[PDB]
Structures are given as structure tokens and as C-alpha cells.
Design a protein around this ligand. Sequence first.
Ligand SMILES: *[C@@H]1O[C@H](CO)[C@@H](O)[C@H](O)[C@H]1O[C@H]1C[C@](C)(N)[C@H](O)[C@H](C)O1
Ligand SMILES: *[C@@H]1O[C@H](CO)[C@@H](O)[C@H](O)[C@H]1O[C@H]1C[C@](C)(N)[C@H](O)[C@H](C)O1
Ligand SMILES: [Cl-]
Ligand SMILES: [Cl-]
Ligand SMILES: [Cl-]
Ligand SMILES: [Cl-]
Lengths: 7, 7
Amino acid sequence: XXNXXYX
Amino acid sequence: XXNXXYX
Ligand SMILES: *[C@@H]1O[C@H](CO)[C@@H](O)[C@H](O)[C@H]1O[C@H]1C[C@](C)(N)[C@H](O)[C@H](C)O1
Ligand SMILES: *[C@@H]1O[C@H](CO)[C@@H](O)[C@H](O)[C@H]1O[C@H]1C[C@](C)(N)[C@H](O)[C@H](C)O1
Ligand SMILES: [Cl-]
Ligand SMILES: [Cl-]
Ligand SMILES: [Cl-]
Ligand SMILES: [Cl-]
């Protein structure tokens, strides 16, 4: 993970 | 990707 979003 | 670094 480590990313974010939101999709 | 998804991992990091820095090499
Ligand atoms: C992770 O490194 C890339 C280069 O490969 C940069 O372009 C990017 O800004 C950097 O990402 C940030 C944001 C993220 C992905 N949510 C994490 O918090 C990382 C550690 O920092
Ligand atoms: C997403 O990350 C930001 C930056 O650290 C926090 O401010 C935010 O609280 C966080 O979102 C929470 C709530 C969410 C979107 N429902 C998910 O549970 C994420 C993983 O954590
Ligand atoms: Cl994560
Ligand atoms: Cl992070
Ligand atoms: Cl999402
Ligand atoms: Cl690197």
C-alpha cells in the first residue's frame, strides 16, 4: 500500500 | 511500483 486514493 | 527506495 502506502499510496492513498480514493478511487 | 509500490515499494519505496532510495537506492
Ligand atoms: C514516492 O516517490 C515518488 C518517486 O518514485 C514520488 O514521485 C512521490 O511523491 C513519493 O510518494 C509520496 C506519497 C506516497 C506515495 N503516498 C507516500 O507517502 C510516499 C512515501 O511519499
Ligand atoms: C488517509 O490518510 C490520511 C493521511 O495520513 C489521514 O488523514 C486519513 O485519516 C486517512 O484515512 C483513513 C480513513 C479511511 C479513508 N476511511 C481509511 O480508513 C484510511 C486507511 O485511513
Ligand atoms: Cl498500506
Ligand atoms: Cl507513507
Ligand atoms: Cl479507494
Ligand atoms: Cl531509488
